[PDB]
Amino acid sequence: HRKVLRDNIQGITKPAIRRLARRGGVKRISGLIYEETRGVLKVFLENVIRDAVTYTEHAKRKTVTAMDVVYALKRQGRTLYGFGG
Amino acid sequence: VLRDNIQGITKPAIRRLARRGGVKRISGLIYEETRGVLKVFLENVIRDAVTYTEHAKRKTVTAMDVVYALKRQGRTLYGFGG
Amino acid sequence: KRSRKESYSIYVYKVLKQVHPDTGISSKAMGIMNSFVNDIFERIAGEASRLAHYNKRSTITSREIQTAVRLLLPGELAKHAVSEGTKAVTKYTSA
Amino acid sequence: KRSRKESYSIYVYKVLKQVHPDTGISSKAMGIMNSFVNDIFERIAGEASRLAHYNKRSTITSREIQTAVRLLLPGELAKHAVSEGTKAVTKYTSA
Amino acid sequence: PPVSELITKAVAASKERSGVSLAALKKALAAAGYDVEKNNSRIKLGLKSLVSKGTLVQTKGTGASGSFKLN
Amino acid sequence: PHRYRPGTVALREIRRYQKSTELLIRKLPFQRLVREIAQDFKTDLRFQSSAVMALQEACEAYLVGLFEDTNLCAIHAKRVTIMPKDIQLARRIRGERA
Amino acid sequence: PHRYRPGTVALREIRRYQKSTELLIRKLPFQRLVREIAQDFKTDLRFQSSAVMALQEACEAYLVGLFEDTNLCAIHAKRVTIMPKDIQLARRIRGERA
Amino acid sequence: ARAKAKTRSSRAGLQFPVGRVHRLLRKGNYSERVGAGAPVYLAAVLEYLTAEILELAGNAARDNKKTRIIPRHLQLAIRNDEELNKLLGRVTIAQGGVLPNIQAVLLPK
Amino acid sequence: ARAKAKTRSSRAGLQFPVGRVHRLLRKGNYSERVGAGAPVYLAAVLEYLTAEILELAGNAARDNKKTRIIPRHLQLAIRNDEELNKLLGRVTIAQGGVLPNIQAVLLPK
DNA sequence: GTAATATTGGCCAGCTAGGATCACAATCCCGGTGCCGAGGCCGCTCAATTGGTCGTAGACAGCTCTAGCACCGCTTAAACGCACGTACGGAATCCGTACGTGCGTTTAAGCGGTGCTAGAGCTGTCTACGACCAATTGAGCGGCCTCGGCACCGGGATTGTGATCCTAGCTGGCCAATATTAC
DNA sequence: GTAATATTGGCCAGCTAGGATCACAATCCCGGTGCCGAGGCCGCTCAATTGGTCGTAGACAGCTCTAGCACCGCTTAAACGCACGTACGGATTCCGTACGTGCGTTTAAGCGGTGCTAGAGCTGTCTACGACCAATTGAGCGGCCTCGGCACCGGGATTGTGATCCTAGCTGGCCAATATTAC
């Protein structure tokens, strides 16, 4: 029922980072960017998911709804429109 | 009326600010750029302060108006009674 | 059963048909406009409420709205928004 | 006549004498501490109120405070603040 | 070994249409086992004087910069 | 024999991925990763699909803006290549701890 | 004849102005400047002294933080000197229009 | 004995709902009391922002030969307008993408 | 017929005022109603933050041989603590100055 | 082949790097001192407390059913790994000059002291306005239906890139026209 | 004074560039298709409206006096301008290799599908809890006094920096020894 989903950060693969970066306009990328970005991403996610699970727990719910995520981002001053804000 | 006192933020004053910021060597163009930057900042802060003032039907800008102007700008200033 | 959610969609569609009679709006975009309007509303209303208490004023009035609008919107946007809003309140007061 | 300014100064002085009996406080720093307490207050109270409405709850209770504290303070600060606060509310409930 | 005798042997190591680079002289003299680390300025004067004699020639750059040839 | 010189196809794919809007992170790895992160704070947590999609949309916007600032830092160095030092600087200046 | 080599007295004064707290902008020029800015929005405006002192206090903190970020940008370039390009970059990355 | 119904928005010559905004200022617990002109002024302000946005977005879509605006068009309208990009600068738009923006130095010579 | 006065803060074993905070949550019109444990918990939280700050600031002042804390000491306490510098990171302190921070490359060799 | 000379090696002089030392000035440390702000005391006030009432917000149980989760099996598309190679970053060098440093001269900031007014802040009156309630009603919601915009595709048309060929401009060597040296 | 050699300018030839040409991939475009989401219609409901009452927030007027402004004069630290020089930025070159690009190979995402059910979401009950109130009262505020912390001053001490000299080492040159040349 509850899988142990460890070691997954490497699932954000090198080409996925390539295409996001490319969407950001960068042309040439050093091979060390990948680990740095994975670390950045784990940090960002940690903060967002902490805030979201908190907003969830308060409701006594055991499911994190999208309203919880948009409130968490909005709380971090990164408001996101289109998901029921 | 007052005019061209933006030069009042003199070269050594910019030098000392930078130094408080950890700056060691400075190119001579920094001075005009920083005067412009500073002019931008103030015109936003003062716009917000005079607005808060006008709203209170008041004709003097209190320190509390300045605090709230910065606090809106997300640069809350302690020490002034805020 | 009857379940009611809140949106601005029809109002947005009205505005759109006032400005672009020959243009459509995807329900994805109408969910962003709805979120758009609610976020701008939350900022303005929060600033107006916040400003009234910071002025020891217990009521939100046209003044409180006028300075929050003037305060949030930058420059040419504020000048026109303020202008049409004053026009509208005048018309409403006259009515 | 009668003019009233609000502060936390004496409470700050009490806390200070509890932690550093042999230390003083500048009036300038007590105006900073007063502003600091009011700022932290405003953040926490705004988040708790804002949360309750976002949860369709009309009341601020220990739960709303607990989640706002847990939200705003990061890590080891939150864990200890939460801990002492729970201890204090328990004592108050017992009394 | 005294300098100005290994630099000749180093520049003698190649024919290049725009001369042997300074990086080559560094690598060659290191391969001769010389303390190019500490004697760098001595090396620069030996080279510049020896091209100034015309025994060598400098053909791109200036000074120790660029590239060099035999007479 | 045909081989585009380095940097050309990169520019084409730049034009492409800027013209486009598709989510760029693969969906299942990102969902599993999200579950990884949430698992640390509490176990047996359930996610609506819209919520995971929101995390993904937000992550993509955050990293894209970060790469914008990073590319600006790299260009300022007069270096076309980005390196991690650029990321730590872009983040430190954004004010986030780094 | 005595002359400190360039950069030494600068570091001394760095240690100094970081140990210190005195306001760095001269008070009267800054007050007159503030009046120049306010005059554009409305005429005959009166300032409490505490209010002008607040503007000065805030400007010094803002420029100091800006110079922190700018010096980081300059050092990233591997250039000890700061130049205006550093300022436009630091500001553009702070997100303020520049 | 009862006058013909005349919606406050029609009394103001608007499309945005005055009653709904009125409700939301009172039921938002913003203030215990709300003046009468506040909801009118506010609805007009929201009207102006939505009309500005929709004008720009429709321009972007017609420019892209799309007869219907979609989120990318909103992202274009926003990011191509200076004062809006200032107002919504800290904002992330769903499915918006990014402006086409290649820094000049990156183009080959 | 009237019990001996016992302040809520003494009923909680605190120094911060429970009545004043209670008043502020009700008067600030945050919510129409306020539970009973909320002001207690909040006063305790404000207590913990002020005690943490004052501990660190007093340490800084004694470190600087200063028997009395002044704003520079607060700036030192804040900026030298990681989690506080995180909480008050966007904050500018009056007369605070800056941490002594010279980047290594700037020192001569 | 042997000895003298001319080339090279050994000794001496000159130059440099590292180490040591001195000069000197910025900082620190220490006493004393006088100022004045922190801190305590007193009295007065109003906000906190107590106890009682009353209404209702929300805790709680119970039920519906949506939506989340889990597993399965094909189908590609994407990820991966590797070969090859070139554009890039980065080290090294050098040069010109822009800024730091320091000095002497000028300016105006700062103090402080005086005088004046406008505006900050408060109080009291009184009233327009908004909350509230009850009755009314139609705009907005969800559900159904429907059809045109649009995604996709298949097949041409247009463009961009990378590589090659030719005409051309520039530079070098020899010849033509001209100065320099020898007879 | 005259001629041969050498010197200098021009031409032909060769090398390198720039322009033109080609061939392929990517982009786009034009047109057809269906498909599904946008847009319209329907009878429902609660929210909007209307009208009337109460009271109270706030507009308004008037008074006070704080404090903001203006102005003068002096002293002096800070600003300014200039001279001077070093270290820096930046241009140049070169090199190695990390990236990029293009193959084949592998993986797992994605899709569609089925099955299961926890848990979201709503409803009803009811009571604990919080608002409100009057009467009570003591903590907290303002005013006043004070005395110890500390900023300043001056002398002595320490540290840091730049400048200088000394010594060992090495390189370059002369004389003597050896290798080469001559006898």
Numbering used by the authors:
A (entry chain B): 18 to 102
B (entry chain F): 21 to 102
C (entry chain H), D (entry chain D): 30 to 124
E (entry chain K): 38 to 108
F (entry chain A), G (entry chain E): 38 to 135
H (entry chain G), I (entry chain C): 10 to 118
Quote the passages of the study that discuss this structure, keeping the authors' original sentences.
Linker histones are major nucleosome-binding proteins, which mediate chromatin compaction, and approximately 50–130% amounts of linker histones relative to nucleosomes are present in cells. We determined the cryo-EM structures of the nucleosome and the H1–nucleosome complex with 24-bp linker DNAs and compared them to the structures of the DEK–nucleosome complexes. Linker histone H1 is a major nucleosome-binding protein that also adopts tripartite DNA binding in the nucleosome but does not interact with the acidic patch. We found that the linker DNAs are sharply bent in the DEK2–nucleosome complex and their orientations shift toward opposite sides compared to those in the free and H1–nucleosome complexes (side views). In contrast, the linker DNA orientation of the DEK1–nucleosome complex is intermediate between those of the H1–nucleosome and DEK2–nucleosome complexes. For comparison, we visualized the polynucleosome in the presence of linker histone H1. The average size of the H1-containing polynucleosomes was 312 pixels. Therefore, the compaction of the polynucleosome by DEK may not be as drastic as that by linker histone H1.
